[PDB]
Design a protein around this ligand. Structure first.
Ligand SMILES: Nc1ncnc2c1ncn2[C@@H]1O[C@H](COP(=O)(O)OP(=O)(O)OP(=O)(O)O)[C@@H](O)[C@H]1O
Ligand SMILES: Nc1ncnc2c1ncn2[C@@H]1O[C@H](COP(=O)(O)OP(=O)(O)OP(=O)(O)O)[C@@H](O)[C@H]1O
Ligand SMILES: CC(C)Cn1c(=O)n(C)c(=O)c2nc[nH]c21
Ligand SMILES: [Ca+2]
Ligand SMILES: [Zn+2]
Ligand SMILES: [Zn+2]
Lengths: 694, 146, 49, 48
């Protein structure tokens, strides 16, 4: 493996049909036989692993202990027909057959898998690189065909990206992807986050900041993977472990609890339909259930208590699952502002930024980067801004002890204190807790859940407050959420349309109060008139209440003007009220809703169509790639897959810096400096090597 | 075929065979497909409408029962909100069908201590239920055409 | 997928679909791994015949 | 009609140089080319 790494380093910066790559191919040709032997070793053991799992092999197994004899093993091999006689004899020799000739095929198969995996991966990488940089060489396809099984096995784990390197040329990078990382990426929540991020960046995202947004998405997703792994499942300490188990179960089953709470709300509100009011007990009214069984009231009580419990569990599940991301992002943006913008060092928040004022508190707190990984940002900010702004000033702002700083590096201090409840209390950081709790209370979802819970508690006081929990169907169902979003889209416009309607009705009310009071009697009895426009406020209320609700307007509700000196004035009045108010403004409301539907639809269509026509990374169109068959999807699955770009960052983080290649070090340094130039833009490996490739 | 056989038992079952004009005619099939396109959305809009009317019914059952008498004869009152189920049926049946909403069908609140509460009640019912949700249905159909 | 289990062992499986030899093709392709007798039992095939 | 007018104005300004009329694709052949073009090479504020 180390030798193969040396060869791969020799291939750093290699161009298509490069002399070093051709030299490698010639050397491999010289060493063909031994290369074939190595590839055959790997593929034979790879196939043995699957054969032993094959049930047809298990048919030959006739021993309760799970052992298989040498003859029966030979027959199984010849039945599967993949192996030759010499190969079967070699496998028999490698089998640790007892005196009874019995074999443990399980351990036999498992023996050489882990030892040979890294060398297998690096051989696959070498062959892939050589094939892609010397695309036309018959001597290489022989080796590739022989390596088929290795390549198929390592295909999900062979990550492939393209960067703009120091050579001012596009370079392909091959790396390893871990099964756990791939699984975590394929988890559905990451998929939803990915879809949301894509929609946002494609619809309201700037090209300049696209890569920064992508890297932020990758960071947040990594943090979410950590949280998911932590909550995943395989006397004070016993209490603690039970606590973490219970909290993690809540976090894992958060959504199920929300669905259950909605179900309980529906059950309670179904029951509440049976209430009835009577003067007598079953001058005060009495509300009581009306059922024959009598079992419903205790059921209502139990459902109410359980609903409140589930609301509490949902609060805790949210606090355990979702809040950490909020804090991580808030801490991260604060740190990047400090280091790269000098917010509280040079600029200072505008004082209209409540978040900027709130973030002052946590700067001097020891626990500032609790969830966000970078623990050294305070030091970085000091090194960057101290010469100008005052080292003591920076230390005072960030709660730093300059004397303690240097000694910590000089020599290790480990003042381990015994664990105690009092010691824990003293360790609490009240300022960080206050800042955090402000963030949480500002978070909208937490507020919604707290309101849900408060309404449940109020339902216990009066059970009819449990009806508000039925509004959660909007949050639960995507379809209703979209329908409501159509309304919300132009909500400000609708509100101002309502205000304009009120103004128009006020003008009509003024006219009626001046000239048309006689017509606004709603009393049939001549003795007691009920005049709705002798006062301007009453006239306005009358208009806005009855006329708007009427189909023909106020004229439908006020006394006919036939045979009156103002008949034509009033017909104009009524018809204009009808057209302007009833027809046009309402029509405006429907049109706003319809336009919202169309706007959401064309947003989704545009996102789909951009993703199908352009590479999210380079921005090149599908036409160039489709010049070659299947080019665009090959590009988006192999060359410029964004999942592979994230996999590369995870691999970089988990890899030691001494072992980084030149390419990995380049990209790692650019990540540290927050430079996104390595991401290819307007260029690709194919376009760069177009003439040579064709 | 089954409906034809049933028509032989009672000839009025032969009317269901007139629904085949949809399958026969392409134009009607397209018009119906416009509706079906957002059918799930329409169904959930109806469910949301039911929820809103249920909340309004709860409010009326708590505070506005007095106004829900539909009997002119003082001797025999017909109160449509002394029971929650009757109040819900009343709302969903008459108020939705009414142009101005339930306020069109229930007793005027003038000169009552809850007059302003009820005017808010009626106007909000009118805008949300009658105007917006129905508007959503038309908009769904129009978007399906487009 | 569950309903299609029934017709696998039936002689008349490819009645309307042209390829009458698919059972044989499946045997040749998957028998070495999955068991020839198993494939024949699943697809209503008599190996001797 | 008003909405697609605003959308069209936005989309023209994001896809073309107000001065030369060349598309964003040519410039984006080089990274960040279009915004470099519109901020440095063909900024209309600079023409004024
Ligand atoms: N650089 C890119 N990386 C990945 N996908 C890209 C890229 N550029 C464009 N795309 C488009 O993004 C889409 C992503 O494909 P993918 O199947 O993973 O997503 P999906 O449609 O959400 O399906 P899934 O259910 O598998 O998550 C593809 O249609 C591809 O055309
Ligand atoms: N020749 C050009 N000069 C300036 N802008 C151009 C030119 N051609 C196209 N544009 C587009 O015009 C827009 C002008 O950018 P600018 O940030 O000044 O405007 P804005 O979106 O109105 O914002 P601001 O709030 O800063 O005024 C940019 O999106 C740029 O893409
Ligand atoms: C998401 C985060 C916890 C993991 N993470 C990260 O995303 N970036 C970018 C780093 O540089 C880093 N260094 C350590 N952990 C890191
Ligand atoms: Ca090294
Ligand atoms: Zn690309
Ligand atoms: Zn220009």
């Amino acid at each position: 493996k180390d030798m193969v790494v040396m060869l791969l380093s020799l291939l750093e910066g290699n161009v298509v049909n490069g002399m070093i790559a051709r030299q490698m191919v010639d050397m491999l040709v010289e060493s063909s036989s031994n290369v074939e032997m190595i590839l055959k070793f790997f593929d034979m053991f790879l196939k043995l692993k699957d054969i032993v799992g094959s049930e047809a092999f298990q048919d030959y197994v006739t021993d309760p202990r799970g052992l298989i004899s040498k003859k029966d093993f030979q027959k199984a091999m010849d039945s599967q027909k993949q192996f030759t006689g010499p190969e079967i004899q070699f496998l028999l020799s490698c089998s640790e057959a007892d005196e009874n000739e019995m074999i443990n095929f399980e351990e036999f198969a498992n023996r050489f898998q882990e030892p040979a995996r890294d060398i297998g991966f690096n051989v696959a990488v070498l062959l892939t690189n050589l094939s892609e940089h010397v695309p036309h060489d018959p001597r290489l396809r022989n080796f590739l065909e022989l390596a088929e099984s290795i390549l198929e096995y390592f295909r999900p784990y062979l990550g492939r990206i393209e960067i703009m390197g120091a050579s001012r040329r596009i370079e392909r990078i091959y790396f390893e992807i871990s099964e756990t990382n791939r699984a975590q990426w394929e988890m559905p929540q990451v998929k939803e986050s990915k879809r949301q991020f894509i929609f946002d960046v494609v619809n309201e995202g700037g090209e300049a900041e696209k890569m920064e947004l992508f890297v932020s998405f990758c960071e947040d997703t990594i943090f979410e993977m950590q949280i998911a792994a932590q909550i995943s499942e395989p006397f004070w300490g016993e209490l603690e472990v039970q606590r973490v188990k219970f909290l993690n179960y809540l976090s894992r089953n958060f959504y199920t609890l929300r669905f259950l709470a909605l179900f309980l709300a529906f059950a309670i509100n179904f029951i509440l339909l049976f209430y009835k009011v009577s003067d007598s007990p079953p001058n005060m009214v009495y509300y009581f259930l009306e059922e024959s069984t009598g079992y419903m009231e205790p059921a209502l009580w139990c459902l109410s208590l359980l609903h409140t419990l589930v609301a509490f569990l949902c609060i805790i599940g949210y606090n355990c699952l979702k809040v950490p991301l909020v804090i991580f992002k808030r801490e991260k943006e604060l740190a990047r502002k400090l280091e790269f913008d000098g917010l509280y060092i040079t600029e200072q928040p505008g004082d209209d930024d409540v978040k900027g004022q709130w973030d002052r508190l946590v700067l001097n707190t020891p626990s500032f980067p609790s969830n966000y990984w970078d623990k050294f940002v305070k030091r970085k900010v000091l090194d960057k801004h101290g010469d100008i702004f005052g080292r003591e000033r920076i230390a005072e702002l960030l709660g730093m002890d300059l004397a303690s700083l240097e000694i910590t590096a000089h020599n290790e201090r480990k003042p381990d204190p015994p664990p105690g409840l009092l010691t824990w209390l003293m360790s609490i950081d009240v300022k960080y807790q206050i800042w955090k709790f402000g963030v949480i209370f500002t978070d909208n979802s937490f507020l919604y859940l707290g309101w849900y819970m408060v309404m449940s508690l109020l339902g216990h006081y009066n059970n009819f407050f449990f009806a508000a929990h039925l509004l959660d169907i909007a949050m639960g169902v995507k379809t209703l959420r979209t329908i409501l979003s159509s309304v919300t889209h132009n909500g400000k416009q609708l509100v101002m349309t309502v205000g304009l309607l009120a103004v128009v009705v006020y003008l009509y009310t003024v006219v009626a109060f001046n000239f048309f009071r006689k017509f606004y009697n709603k009393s049939e009895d001549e003795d007691e008139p009920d005049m709705k426009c002798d006062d301007m406020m009453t006239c306005y209320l009358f208009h806005m209440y009855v006329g708007v609700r009427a189909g023909g307007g106020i004229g439908d509700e006020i006394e006919d003007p036939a045979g009156d000196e103002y008949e034509l004035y009033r017909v104009v009045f009524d018809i204009t009220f009808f057209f302007f108010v009833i027809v046009i403004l309402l029509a405006i409301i429907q049109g706003l809703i319809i336009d919202a539907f169309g706007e959401l639809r064309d947003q989704q269509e545009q996102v789909k169509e951009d993703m199908e026509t352009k590479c999210f990374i380079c921005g090149i169109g599908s036409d160039y790639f489709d010049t070659t068959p299947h080019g665009f999807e090959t590009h988006t699955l192999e060359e410029h897959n964004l999942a592979n770009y994230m996999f590369f960052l995870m691999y970089l983080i988990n890899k030691d810096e001494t072992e980084h290649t030149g390419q990995e070090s380049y990209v790692w340094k650019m990540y540290q400096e927050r430079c996104w130039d390595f991401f290819p833009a307007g260029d690709c490996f194919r376009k760069q090597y177009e003439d040579q490739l064709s």
